[PDB]
Design a protein around this ligand. Structure first.
Ligand SMILES: [Cu+]
Ligand SMILES: [Cu+]
Ligand SMILES: [K+]
Ligand SMILES: [K+]
Ligand SMILES: [K+]
Ligand SMILES: [K+]
Ligand SMILES: [K+]
Ligand SMILES: [K+]
Ligand SMILES: [K+]
Ligand SMILES: [K+]
Ligand SMILES: [K+]
Ligand SMILES: [K+]
Ligand SMILES: [K+]
Ligand SMILES: [K+]
Ligand SMILES: [K+]
Ligand SMILES: [K+]
Ligand SMILES: [K+]
Ligand SMILES: [K+]
Ligand SMILES: [Mg+2]
Ligand SMILES: [Mg+2]
Ligand SMILES: [Mg+2]
Ligand SMILES: [Mg+2]
Ligand SMILES: [Mg+2]
Ligand SMILES: [Mg+2]
Ligand SMILES: [Mg+2]
Ligand SMILES: [Mg+2]
Ligand SMILES: [Mg+2]
Ligand SMILES: [Mg+2]
Ligand SMILES: [Mg+2]
Ligand SMILES: [Mg+2]
Ligand SMILES: [Mg+2]
Ligand SMILES: [Mg+2]
Ligand SMILES: [Mg+2]
Ligand SMILES: [Mg+2]
Ligand SMILES: [Mg+2]
Ligand SMILES: [Mg+2]
Ligand SMILES: [Mg+2]
Ligand SMILES: [Mg+2]
Ligand SMILES: [Mg+2]
Ligand SMILES: [Mg+2]
Lengths: 148, 271, 117, 103, 55, 77
RNA sequence: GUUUAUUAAAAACACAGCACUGUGCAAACACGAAAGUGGACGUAUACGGUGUGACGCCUGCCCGGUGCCGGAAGGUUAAUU
RNA sequence: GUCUCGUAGAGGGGGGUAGAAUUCCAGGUGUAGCGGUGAAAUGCGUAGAGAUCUGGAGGAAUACCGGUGGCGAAGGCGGCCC
């Protein structure tokens, strides 16, 4: 299937590229996510005539993501409280939803889909390092302090 | 206790009863009762689809709490009871807030005992926790297979499961069959063994005692005519063929599991 | 094909045979020889000379790896306990350590019944 | 009212929890009219042989006089505490207060 | 009295391989040899002493 | 019914033939799958029961054109 | 106890007991182009299939044939290309 | 024969636990033998055994101490802890 990329897609190409991808790749991911469109004559001519504003919007999105990442980094450390045993091990667990809620209460709005926990979901009291992905290329870090 | 009947009649000579002088002698707890009428082994086409089922005693269904998700609130066992629907006994328990429920009765549970469920419950028989919070090597019963679905494994009298290992999001279990089975560690399990272990020691003693339980006679295929069963036929007692079901499938060792969807959870088959 | 220069020679000295296996320090085998495989059978297979020949053959088999230093682990009561070590030293290796690793149950399983010969 | 000597070994990665465990256990003993004759913290020591693939452990020694019920509860706590890798409870003829050969 | 914590003293009554030395070799009285054996076994369990030298 | 919502493909009958040419009646069924199609112009997913051929037809013609055809035919989705 | 309503009531069938075997639950299995339903609001001390037939003392040798179970290095081998 | 203080002891019943070793399972290295006997053969091995390293499962018994040593009516009783 021939498609026109509407953004930067890793291992595929840059915006405006015309690429041949597997039909399922286009059908179930790229088009529904908005990262590409079918390479019909209408689409090709329309995009080529109306192209540059899209890079302007992509730059605006990247700048907004950078600003949000800077705010997240400036937030530094966020503290979450739960219940645990005397050994410091939590009976329950601390996940993306409540981490994002704590960050939002701290001031920066982050969705649960932007939380990236490398070593699974937190289960012990102490300090952990969590990552945030607000853009496909930028990354932020937050210290999480779990207390009883 | 296991009690042998005296042979005052040929139908009583071989009877062995399991007599428990702790079960409630009165009526069950009505709000947790439902009617349950009989099928005779017939489906909604009205056809017999499982042979040898019919008759037997009328039975009310007791609503049993297999989920055990009323967390953080202690309950006290009020009494043990007979349940016609299953081999295990059940226990009526009263929660602190005034709610009553039925649970499977673990071995050793008696009236006055306290039970609890949830991540912070004590490691004691009758308490229910996610297996993430149960020590490896423990004996448990009424084990969930999906978190929140409710207990499904080791529910029969005297049965239990062993937690043999815990790796990541999964625990490995030794089932009563001998199978080693992976289950999510967020699945719940109740500490201890199912009670009423003496159940298997009973001896029915007469044909009628099976009829009381809703079991109708088995007719051997070799006792039939060929039109009825692959085994039928013969001038006298004849066989001369590989044993099969009434529908022709070998019935002496041929395996019939075929579930590629759940194969990934079987660490080791029972044999 | 990778140089090691620091190996371990395991001697399995049983009453009937001697097995010599040279590994690296992590237990990965590089080569082996046995008294039974070095042209000896029957009563000849269970002699110190056969064990020495097996040790020489094992040294030859590991010659490519360029081993210089050898620890030695001897296990079993067989007659090839010391001839193998002597041959290994004569082959040019530097014998750094010698250790007995014969297993001894601390009780253990019941042994087979006594032979009535 | 009997006299006990309790030695327990903590996983080295949980060495920071040792003072908390010591305080909790001593409080549990003293709650039921128990006495602590001796309390020593040997710190991390090298094990003579590996235990659970470890090579060092944090040793704590206590000498107390406590009822059997609280001693059994303490043993249950040791069994179900994942940090305690090995414990040992012994009866002693009398109270022991003198310094151990470790210190 | 023999103390299972007295590792320095206990080490005089074990071989290089860790085995308990006979009282007929050490010149120890029998009553104290029994206490020594008990103390050594306790120390082995607490991992203050090795069971075998291949540790 | 085992019918494609896009092409109208449905079971057809024919014969199995053996080497001795014995004919026994059989059916040929369509390769149908229930699939969630993203409609961009309505910001939603619509589920259709479609043959693999119908999926190719949607790839070629666009889900909007196909859905307009379905509305014209009166086939609800 | 059951049976050839209408020439056979029996030594036949069933039976409690016994064994083999299948079945980890959306169970095996069965009715059903299917959806579903029975199995079971049961969960291996459970459920199906098969043989034997209270109880007592017992149940020896043969895996070459046929079947079932396991293996997968090699030979041969379909559509496809 | 009873009481008071103390002593040694594999005396008994119940529960827990530790280390060595055997077997089995999985994986890594590695290659033509292994195992067995008086000598052999059956058996195991190129479908990768035996050997060596790592992880796991499980049952049974407790090296050294240990002794014409101890305890128990006899039969008998042996790691450690309660
Ligand atoms: Cu239809
Ligand atoms: Cu083929
Ligand atoms: K019942
Ligand atoms: K029958
Ligand atoms: K027949
Ligand atoms: K017949
Ligand atoms: K006949
Ligand atoms: K523990
Ligand atoms: K009759
Ligand atoms: K009949
Ligand atoms: K069965
Ligand atoms: K009889
Ligand atoms: K009888
Ligand atoms: K045969
Ligand atoms: K055969
Ligand atoms: K083949
Ligand atoms: K005593
Ligand atoms: K023991
Ligand atoms: Mg109908
Ligand atoms: Mg049946
Ligand atoms: Mg029933
Ligand atoms: Mg039967
Ligand atoms: Mg007939
Ligand atoms: Mg037929
Ligand atoms: Mg005949
Ligand atoms: Mg015949
Ligand atoms: Mg057939
Ligand atoms: Mg032998
Ligand atoms: Mg002779
Ligand atoms: Mg015709
Ligand atoms: Mg009738
Ligand atoms: Mg008649
Ligand atoms: Mg008649
Ligand atoms: Mg169902
Ligand atoms: Mg179905
Ligand atoms: Mg159903
Ligand atoms: Mg018969
Ligand atoms: Mg054969
Ligand atoms: Mg086969
Ligand atoms: Mg086994």
């Amino acid at each position: 299937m021939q498609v026109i990329l509407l953004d930067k897609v890793a291992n595929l190409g840059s915006l405006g590229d015309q690429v041949n991808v597997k039909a399922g790749y286009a059908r179930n991911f790229l088009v529904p996510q908005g990262k590409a469109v079918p390479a019909t004559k209408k689409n090709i001519e329309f995009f080529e005539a109306r192209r540059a504003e899209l890079e302007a919007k992509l730059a605006e999105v990247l700048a907004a993501a950078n600003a949000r990442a800077e705010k997240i980094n400036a937030l530094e450390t966020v503290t979450i409280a739960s219940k645990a045993g005397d050994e410091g091990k939590l009976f329950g667990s601390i996940g993306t939803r409540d981490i994002a809620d704590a960050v939002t209460a701290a001031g920066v709005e982050v969705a649960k889909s932007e939380v990236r926990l490398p070593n699974g979901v937190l289960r012990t009291t102490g300090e952990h390092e969590v990552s945030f992905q607000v853009h496909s290329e930028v990354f932020a870090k937050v210290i999480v302090n779990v207390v009883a | 206790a296991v009690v042998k009947c005296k042979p005052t009649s040929p139908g009583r000579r071989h009877v062995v009863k399991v007599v428990n002088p702790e079960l409630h002698k009165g009526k069950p707890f009505a709000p947790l009762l439902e009617k349950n009428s009989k099928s005779g082994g017939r489906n909604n086409n009205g056809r017999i689809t499982t042979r040898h089922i019919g008759g037997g005693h009328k039975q009310a269904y007791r609503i049993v709490d297999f989920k055990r998700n009323k967390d953080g609130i202690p309950a006290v066992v009020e009494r043990l009871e007979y349940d016609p629907n299953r081999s295990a006994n059940i226990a009526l328990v009263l929660y602190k807030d005034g709610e009553r429920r039925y649970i499977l009765a673990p071995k050793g549970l008696k009236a006055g005992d306290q039970i609890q469920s949830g991540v912070d419950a004590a490691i004691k028989p009758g308490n229910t926790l996610p297996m993430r919070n149960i020590p490896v090597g423990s004996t448990v019963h009424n084990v969930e297979m999906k978190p929140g679905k409710g207990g499904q494994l080791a529910r029969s009298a005297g049965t239990y499961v062993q937690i043999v290992a815990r790796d990541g999001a999964y625990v490995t279990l030794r089932l009563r069959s001998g199978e080693m089975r992976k289950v999510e560690a967020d699945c719940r399990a109740t500490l201890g063994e199912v009670g009423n272990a003496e159940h298997m020691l009973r001896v029915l003693g007469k044909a009628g005692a099976a009829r009381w339980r809703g079991v109708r006679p088995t007719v051997r295929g070799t006792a039939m005519n060929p039109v009825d069963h692959p085994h039928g036929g013969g001038e006298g007692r004849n066989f001369g063929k590989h044993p099969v079901t009434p529908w022709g499938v070998q019935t002496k060792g041929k395996k019939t599991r075929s579930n590629k969807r759940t194969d990934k959870f079987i660490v080791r088959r029972r044999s | 094909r990778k140089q090691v220069s620091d190996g371990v020679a395991h001697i399995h000295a049983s009453f009937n045979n001697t097995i010599v296996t040279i590994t690296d320090r992590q237990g990965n085998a590089l080569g082996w020889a046995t008294a039974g495989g070095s042209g000896f059978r029957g009563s000849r297979k269970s002699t110190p000379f056969a064990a020495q020949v097996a040790a020489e053959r094992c040294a030859d088999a590991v010659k490519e790896y360029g081993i210089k230093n050898l620890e030695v682990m001897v296990k079993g009561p067989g007659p090839g306990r010391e001839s193998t070590i002597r041959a290994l030293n004569a082959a040019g290796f530097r014998i750094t350590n010698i250790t007995d690793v014969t297993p001894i149950p601390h009780x253990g399983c019941r042994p087979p019944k006594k032979r009535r010969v | 009212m009997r006299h006990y000597e309790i030695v327990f070994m903590v996983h080295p990665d949980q060495s920071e929890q040792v003072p908390g465990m010591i305080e909790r256990y001593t409080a549990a003993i003293t709650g039921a009219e128990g006495k602590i004759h001796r309390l020593e913290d040997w710190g991390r020591r090298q094990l003579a042989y590996p235990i659970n693939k470890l090579h060092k452990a944090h040793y704590v020694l206590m000498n107390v006089e406590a009822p059997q019920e609280v001693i059994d509860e303490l043993e249950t706590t040791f069994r179900f505490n994942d940090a305690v890798i090995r414990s040992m409870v012994m009866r002693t003829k009398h109270a022991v207060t003198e310094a151990s050969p470790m210190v | 009295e023999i103390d299972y914590k007295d590792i320095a003293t206990l080490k005089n009554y074990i071989t290089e391989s860790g085995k308990i030395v006979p009282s007929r070799i050490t010149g120890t009285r029998a009553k104290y040899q029994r206490q020594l054996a008990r103390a050594i076994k306790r120390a082995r369990y607490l991992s203050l002493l090795p069971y075998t030298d291949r540790h | 019914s085992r019918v494609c919502q896009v092409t109208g493909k449905r079971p057809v009958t024919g014969n199995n033939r053996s080497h001795a040419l014995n004919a026994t009646k059989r059916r040929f069924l369509p390769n149908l799958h229930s699939h969630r199609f993203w409609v961009e112009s309505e910001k939603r997913f619509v589920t259709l029961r479609v043959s693999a051929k119908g999926m190719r037809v949607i790839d070629k013609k666009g889900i909007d054109t196909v859905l307009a055809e379905l509305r014209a035919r009166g086939e609800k989705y």
